[PDB]
Write a protein that binds this ligand. Structure first.
Ligand SMILES: CC(C)[C@@H](NC(=O)[C@H](CS)NC(=O)CCC[C@H](N)C(=O)O)C(=O)O
Length: 329
């Protein structure tokens, strides 16, 4: 009744190199995947995802209720009015199974001019006690830059795939201003599993999270070896096989906008599965004032009707809309 999506594995290592022709061959694979289901698996990425999964688990399984309140975002703790994005997202036993921890650009400090200006979507990360979680902040901050370097390379491939120079996107992806975020999501094993946390799709599938499109330029996602994700096609939702050695990549809704929907943002959802697992997305966001001129690779002139959209405004509205539609995570 449910088929499987074709998610090809793409060796992205040439995108770190200087072999321009081998990088074009990668870009071709990115193009075909973005025109098909919208997903591919980046392999030969150079990131130690075993350590990522290990450190994330140690954190998830040792953080206490007291620590979670102390780090909670505004939605769970009224004392933290400045934490709209960064902080801990608490579970609700009996009602909400998922919980997570989100942090932003480590360069967002009290000295950063965007923090000084109080610009929306900019926040200073919060962190647990170093002695209670030794090495976690240092591991997490390094991972932000590890996956940032991978994402920069991926963006080179997407740029070439669309007929642009390889810095078309990456020039807007900078350490000093990127709004990109990491989210460490824990999906717990629960017995009994609360029914209030399980949603029933229109087609009858039991879901942990309803359909949505990523709010991002691209999404660089690691998940443990538990199949859960599905992508919508015209013939219905298709299962995305799990691969806990690589990264699941897809374009976000900002990419759809700037390419006149040539690279669509795939509609994705999360099947319910009673299994302890991890979902660790990196949302490749640009700067608050970054603006990419839309174009249409279908057209000889590449002309597009779409208005240039400032990334900051896109992000703010996108994250609020996602909360209004799919609920507070
Ligand atoms: C792979 C996804 C379905 C993953 N969930 C997600 O990506 C979820 C829901 S779509 N993403 C979000 O809510 C947006 C988080 C944005 C973040 N707080 C920020 O300020 O930057 C999962 O595993 O649940």
């Amino acid at each position: 009744s449910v088929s499987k999506a074709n998610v090809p594995k793409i060796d992205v290592s040439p995108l770190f190199g200087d072999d321009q022709a081998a990088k074009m061959r990668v870009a071709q694979q990115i193009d075909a995947a973005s025109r098909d289901t919208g997903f591919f698996y980046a392999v030969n990425h150079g990131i130690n995802v075993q350590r990522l999964s290990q450190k994330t688990k140690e954190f998830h399984m040792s953080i206490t209720p007291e620590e979670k309140w102390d780090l909670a975002i505004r939605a769970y703790n009224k004392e933290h009015q400045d934490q709209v994005r960064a902080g801990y997202y608490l579970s609700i036993p009996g009602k909400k199974a998922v919980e997570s921890f989100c942090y932003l650009n480590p360069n967002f400090t009290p000295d950063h001019p965007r923090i000084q200006a109080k610009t929306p979507t900019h926040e200073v990360n919060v962190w647990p006690d170093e002695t209670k979680h030794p090495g976690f902040q240092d591991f997490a901050e390094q991972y932000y830059w590890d996956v940032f370097g991978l994402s920069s390379a991926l963006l080179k491939g997407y740029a070439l795939a669309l007929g642009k120079e390889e810095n078309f996107f990456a020039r807007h992806f900078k350490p000093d201003d990127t709004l990109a975020s990491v989210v460490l999501i824990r999906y717990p094993y629960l017995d009994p599993y609360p029914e209030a946390a399980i949603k029933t799709a229109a087609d009858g599938t039991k879901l942990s999270f309803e359909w949505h499109e990523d709010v991002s330029l691209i999404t660089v996602l690691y998940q443990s070896n538990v199949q859960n994700l599905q992508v919508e096609t015209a013939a219905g939702y298709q299962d995305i096989e799990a691969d806990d050695t690589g990264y699941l990549i897809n374009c976000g809704s900002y990419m759809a906008h700037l390419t006149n929907n040539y690279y669509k943002a795939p509609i994705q959802r999360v099947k319910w599965v009673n299994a302890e697992r991890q979902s660790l997305p990196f949302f490749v966001n640009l700067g608050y004032d970054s603006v990419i001129d839309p174009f249409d690779p279908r057209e000889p002139n590449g002309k597009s009707d779409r208005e240039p959209l400032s990334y900051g405004d896109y992000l703010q509205n996108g994250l609020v809309s996602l909360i209004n539609k799919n609920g507070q995570t």
